[PDB]
Amino acid sequence: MLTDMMKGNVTNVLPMILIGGWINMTFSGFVTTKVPFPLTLRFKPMLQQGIE
Amino acid sequence: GTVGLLLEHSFEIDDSANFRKRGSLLWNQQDGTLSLSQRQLSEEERGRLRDVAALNGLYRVRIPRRPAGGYVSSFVPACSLVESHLSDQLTLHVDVAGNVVGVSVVTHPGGCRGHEVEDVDLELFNTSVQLQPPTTAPGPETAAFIERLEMEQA
Amino acid sequence: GSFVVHDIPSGSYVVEVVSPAYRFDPVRVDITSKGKMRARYVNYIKTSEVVRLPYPLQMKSSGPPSYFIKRESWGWTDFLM
Amino acid sequence: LESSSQKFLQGLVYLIGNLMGLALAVYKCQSMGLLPTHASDWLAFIEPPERMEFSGGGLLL
Amino acid sequence: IESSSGTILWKQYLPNVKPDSSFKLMVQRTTAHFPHPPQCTLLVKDKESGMSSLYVFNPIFGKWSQVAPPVLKRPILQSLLLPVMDQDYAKVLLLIDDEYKVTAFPATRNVLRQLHELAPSIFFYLVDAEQGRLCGYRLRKDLTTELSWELTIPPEVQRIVKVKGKRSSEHVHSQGRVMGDRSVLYKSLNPNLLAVVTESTDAHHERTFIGIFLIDGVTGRIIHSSVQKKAKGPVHIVHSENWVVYQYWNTKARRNEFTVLELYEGTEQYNATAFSSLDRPQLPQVLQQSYIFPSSISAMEATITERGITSRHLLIGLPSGAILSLPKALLDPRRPEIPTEQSREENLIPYSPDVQIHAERFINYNQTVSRMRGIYTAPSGLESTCLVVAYGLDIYQ
Numbered sequence: 001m002l003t004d005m006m007k008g009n010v011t012n013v014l015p016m017i018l019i020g021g022w023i024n025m026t027f028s029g030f031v032t033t034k035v036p037f038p039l040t041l042r043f044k045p046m047l048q049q050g051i052e
Numbered sequence: 053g054t055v056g057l058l059l060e061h062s063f064e065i066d067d068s069a070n071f072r073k074r075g076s077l078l079w080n081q082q083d084g085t086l087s088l089s090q091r092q093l094s095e096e097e098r099g100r101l102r103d104v105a106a107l108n109g110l111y112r113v114r115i116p117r118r119p120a121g122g123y124v125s126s127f128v129p130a131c132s133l134v135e136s137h138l139s140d141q142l143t144l145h146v147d148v149a150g151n152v153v154g155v156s157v158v159t160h161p162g163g164c165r166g167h168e169v170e171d172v173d174l175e176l177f178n179t180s181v182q183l184q185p186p187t188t189a190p191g192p193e194t195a196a197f198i199e200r201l202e203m204e205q206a
Numbered sequence: 207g208s209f210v211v212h213d214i215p216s217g218s219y220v221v222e223v224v225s226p227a228y229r230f231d232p233v234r235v236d237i238t239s240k241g242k243m244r245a246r247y248v249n250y251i252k253t254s255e256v257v258r259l260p261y262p263l264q265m266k267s268s269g270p271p272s273y274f275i276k277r278e279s280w281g282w283t284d285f286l287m
Numbered sequence: 288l289e290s291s292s293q294k295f296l297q298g299l300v301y302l303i304g305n306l307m308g309l310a311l312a313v314y315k316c317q318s319m320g321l322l323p324t325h326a327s328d329w330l331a332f333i334e335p336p337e338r339m340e341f342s343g344g345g346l347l348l
Numbered sequence: 349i350e351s352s353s354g355t356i357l358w359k360q361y362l363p364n365v366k367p368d369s370s371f372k373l374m375v376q377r378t379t380a381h382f383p384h385p386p387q388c389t390l391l392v393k394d395k396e397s398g399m400s401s402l403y404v405f406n407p408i409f410g411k412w413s414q415v416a417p418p419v420l421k422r423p424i425l426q427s428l429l430l431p432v433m434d435q436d437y438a439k440v441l442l443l444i445d446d447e448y449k450v451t452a453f454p455a456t457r458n459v460l461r462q463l464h465e466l467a468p469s470i471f472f473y474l475v476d477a478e479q480g481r482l483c484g485y486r487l488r489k490d491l492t493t494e495l496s497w498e499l500t501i502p503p504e505v506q507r508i509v510k511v512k513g514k515r516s517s518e519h520v521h522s523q524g525r526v527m528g529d530r531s532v533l534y535k536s537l538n539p540n541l542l543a544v545v546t547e548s549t550d551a552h553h554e555r556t557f558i559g560i561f562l563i564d565g566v567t568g569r570i571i572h573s574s575v576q577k578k579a580k581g582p583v584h585i586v587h588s589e590n591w592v593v594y595q596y597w598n599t600k601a602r603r604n605e606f607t608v609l610e611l612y613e614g615t616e617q618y619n620a621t622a623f624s625s626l627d628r629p630q631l632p633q634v635l636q637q638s639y640i641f642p643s644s645i646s647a648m649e650a651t652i653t654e655r656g657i658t659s660r661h662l663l664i665g666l667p668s669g670a671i672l673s674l675p676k677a678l679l680d681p682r683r684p685e686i687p688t689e690q691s692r693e694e695n696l697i698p699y700s701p702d703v704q705i706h707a708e709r710f711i712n713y714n715q716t717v718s719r720m721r722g723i724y725t726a727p728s729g730l731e732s733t734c735l736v737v738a739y740g741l742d743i744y745q
């Protein structure tokens with residue numbers, strides 16, 4: 001019962017993060033869209049993964 | 053020992069060239085120091101500089117190439133010269149062989165902000181004169197790299 | 207396959223066999239005014255070193271060069287971590 | 288927690304507690320720098336200055 | 349030549365052109381004005397006679413345009429492509445003759461009025477290499493020039509060999525750069541900065557030198573006057589947004605060397621609304637660093653993008669025929685000799701005097717361009733692709 005409830009609780013967020021990782025690999029190296037507000041420069045390392 | 057170089061200035065309503073003797077530069081090649089001995093402006097010269105400043109004209113400096121084999125000259129906004137309380141710096145750039153290359157004049161502070169200036173201000177020449185010989189560029193650093201790689205190998 | 211270069215004054219010269227098919231390692235050659243002359247491995251850092259190489263330069267090639275870079279082609283095992 | 292009027296004061300205390308967290312948030316910023324307070328984060332906002340004096344030419348043709 | 353397939357679309361001939369004549373090609377009007385034809389101007393100058401002529405043609409179809417070029421009676425010295433445009437969107441072109449008069453083109457009434465209202469902001473600089481003289485002339489209202497500034501590098505010890513100024517058709521995205529520390533260091537973006545490089549007339553292997561002067565184009569002020577000792581030409585210099593990079597030969601150690609000059613201002617910019625060469629009393633500080641390039645060189649030109657967002661690369665042209673794409677970030681002069689926390693924050697590689705020529709960096713694989721003469725870089729569209737045309741014996745794109 002503990003394993004089942006822990007797996008059920010885990011499956012509410014972890015699939016989203018795994019999909020995010022798969023997307024990050026599959027679509028690495030692009031510039032998809034421009035966020036219409038001026039985000040801070042310190043946020044660069046996570047918004048622009050895969051860009052030099 | 054010491055060599056004297058003439059130094060003329062010019063400023064007119066039409067911004068033409070009417071260079072007149074202003075100061076002598078005593079460049080002592082031994083110790084590498086330059087000192088200027090200029091005469092202060094007169095009433096008519098002060099007025100002429102005032103109209104040149106009004107029309108946003110230029111103040112041109114010129115020195116002979118040799119202690120009449122040529123001339124090297126430059127210019128500075130004269131209205132910026134009068135709005136800086138006649139505070140400027142002329143740098144004499146020469147080359148490695150000790151020949152005159154150029155003269156560069158720039159005021160302090162530069163630009164203009166519309167500051168009205170009274171006549172009494174223009175009775176002093178706050179000029180900073182420097183001589184700039186060519187600065188040797190550094191070669192590639194090899195000793196540090198070889199010693200560092202020797203430490204890395206060991 | 208041999209080569210000869212003429213009209214060389216005394217000094218130090220890096221000899222390289224340029225060929226788009228197969229690269230060749232450059233070799234330095236020091237020729238003196240008297241006539242004796244020697245070959246060695248180039249080293250632009252710490253040039254004072256001497257690593258002698260026989261004068262009849264046997265500059266064997268190192269196979270075709272690598273102008274191209276292979277595709278990444280990451281696998282799922284790369285996605286794992 | 289509205290047993291009496293002190294709830295209102297309690298609410299302020301609650302706000303104070305929230306303020307405490309907010310204060311910690313500031314510390315978090317000091318521990319992360321994720322705030323556009325320095326001039327560096329304004330670098331992308333600087334438009335290039337316009338050229339006032341144009342000068343061309345080169346070696347004699 | 350169509351840049352995609354390499355085929356030839358139109359050919360034209362200019363009768364009676366001497367082999368040593370000097371050319372200058374200017375794009376007066378591009379194709380973004382569909383009701384009007386694109387128009388380019390080529391300026392030829394016979395060396396022996398000195399007379400110069402102007403041939404204007406449509407760059408797409410190749411036929412001479414009906415706009416008759418002016419007859420340049422006097423020999424000319426220099427030409428300028430002013431960004432001001434006529435009503436038909438033709439960029440004004442200025443020529444300075446031997447009597448130092450100025451001839452405009454198309455020189456219509458509107459162009460004459462526009463450049464008469466904007467006359468005092470136009471400066472020419474003429475570099476007479478024979479006498480070792482540099483002159484800088486103003487532009488009066490009535491289309492005449494006056495001696496604004498003049499410098500003399502004595503030909504008896506130094507001859508001017510290159511006057512590479514920064515390209516006019518480029519933009520700079522980041523005015524300053526992040527230094528870490530939550531601080532910013534501002535580049536000294538001077539658009540009128542010459543980079544005159546001269547050799548020593550003394551050809552002895554031990555006393556030769558190469559000078560580089562960062563002469564300003566308007567006020568004549570010498571920003572930098574570096575002189576590298578124990579070095580000999582030929583020298584290949586590229587001048588970009590901020591930095592200059594000039595490769596040379598070092599006679600003492602027999603090895604080709606780079607030397608990067610980066611111009612930096614103070615922690616705060618002197619002026620941001622506009623830049624004027626008459627209002628720069630603060631001499632920008634210079635950062636220098638010399639690297640070793642393990643081969644010779646034949647042509648250099650930085651990769652240029654439309655908005656400058658894409659990083660800058662130098663297209664080193666080796667004698668072998670390859671085109672090395674050296675990253676400019678490698679040639680940073682701020683790379684410390686001993687790594688520190690500041691360098692790690694900025695991610696600066698420790699200073700390494702050796703620059704690698706790894707064969708995987710070549711922009712061409714085996715299409716070697718023998719006896720390479722020049723590299724032209726065009727911004728193209730997009731932001732990551734820069735068009736490259738290496739011209740020499742072979743021509744490669």
Ligand SMILES: *[C@@H]1O[C@H](CO)[C@@H](O[C@@H]2O[C@H](CO)[C@@H](O)[C@H](O)[C@H]2NC(C)=O)[C@H](O)[C@H]1NC(C)=O
Pocket residue numbers: 163164165166339619620621622623624627
């Ligand atoms: C930056 O330089 C300009 C040009 O010298 C200074 O002058 C300003 O120029 C703009 C553009 O023509 C005008 O709109 C302003 O009115 C000018 N200012 C003044 C006071 O005349 C400008 O002042 C400089 N900026 C700073 C901050 O010094």
Ligand SMILES: *[C@@H]1O[C@H](CO)[C@@H](O[C@@H]2O[C@H](CO)[C@@H](O)[C@H](O)[C@H]2NC(C)=O)[C@H](O)[C@H]1NC(C)=O
Pocket residue numbers: 137139140141160178179180
């Ligand atoms: C005379 O000119 C010199 C410049 O050579 C002035 O010195 C500058 O003074 C300002 C403030 O007064 C400082 O911010 C600068 O750093 C100084 N420059 C140097 C190079 O030290 C001097 O102030 C001028 N004197 C007068 C009376 O105006």
